[PDB]
């Protein structure tokens, strides 16, 4: 019931992995389209590729962590503290909300540029989203890395049985 509870809360990680694959390329494309129009917008759009790639690099690790929680022992669950579970839930929820904001901005920038409108607010929003995603994907990455290492060490120390 704990695993079915957290899994419901976090949702499909594969869905996030796929959507970030789509969006990282959409924004690399945008970065090439505007290289000679807005240096500033091109730079932030290019930044999004590596920012989103960090989640994909860690995707197998995140799925593995969820599986470990699914098959957890009484000793393993102590590593899954309430603080850590809350951090997992809140960073994944943050990713989903940020993606909701990020998705329409590529076309919005294309539309603004066509009608010669100011790109300032779009660039500011893209910078804010990039920084937020960097923070949350990095927190998720570190959380998963630490927990998996702790689980491995606990199992290694149980090997004597
Ligand atoms: Na596309
Ligand atoms: Na968090």
Author numbering: 91 to 251
What did the paper state?
In this paper, we describe the molecular architecture of the prototypical bacterial SNARE-like protein IncA, which mediates the homotypic fusion of chlamydial inclusions. IncA is a protein of 273 amino acids composed of a short, cytoplasmic N-terminal moiety (residues 1–34), a bilobed transmembrane domain (residues 35–84), and a long cytoplasmic C-terminal domain that ends in a tail with low complexity (residues 247–273). We demonstrate that IncA folds into a stable, non-canonical four-helix bundle that is maintained as a monomer by intramolecular interactions. Cells infected with an IncA-deficient strain of C. trachomatis similarly displayed multiple inclusions at a high multiplicity of infection, further establishing that IncA is required for the homotypic fusion of inclusions.
To characterize these regions, we first generated a G144A hinge mutant variant and found that IncA87–246(G144A) remains monomeric in solution and it has comparable structural stability as IncA87–246. IncA87–246(G144A) crystallized in a triclinic space group with two IncA87–246(G144A) protomers in the unit cell. Though this crystal form did not diffract as well as the previous one, we were able to collect 88.1% complete data to 1.95 Å resolution and determine an accurate atomic model of IncA87–246(G144A) using molecular replacement. The structure, solved to a Rwork/free of 16.9/21.2 at 1.95 Å resolution, contains two four-helix bundles where the interrupted α-helix HB of IncA87–246 is replaced by a straight continuous helix. Interestingly, the two IncA87–246(G144A) protomers in the triclinic unit cell are noticeably dissimilar (RMSD 1.65 Å), with protomer B characterized by a local unfolding of helix A between residues 100VGSL103. In both protomers, this region is not implicated in crystal contacts, which suggests IncA87–246(G144A) may exist in solution in different microstates, also populated in the crystal lattice. Secondary structure superimposition of IncA87–246 with the reference IncA87–246(G144A) protomer A reveals the G144A mutation results in significant conformational changes throughout the molecule (RMSD 1.68 Å), especially in the helix HD, which is shifted upwards in IncA87–246(G144A). Simulation of IncA87–246(G144A) revealed a spike in RMSF at residue 231, a feature which is absent in both the IncA87–246 and IncA87–237 RMSF profiles. This result agrees with the structural plasticity of IncA87–246(G144A) protomers seen in the triclinic crystal form, which deviate significantly at the C-terminus of helix HD. However, when G144 of the hinge is mutated to alanine, the HD–Hclamp distance narrows and results in a significantly less flexible Hclamp during simulation compared with IncA87–246 and IncA87–237, which may explain experimental results regarding the lack of IncA87–246(G144A) oligomerization in solution.
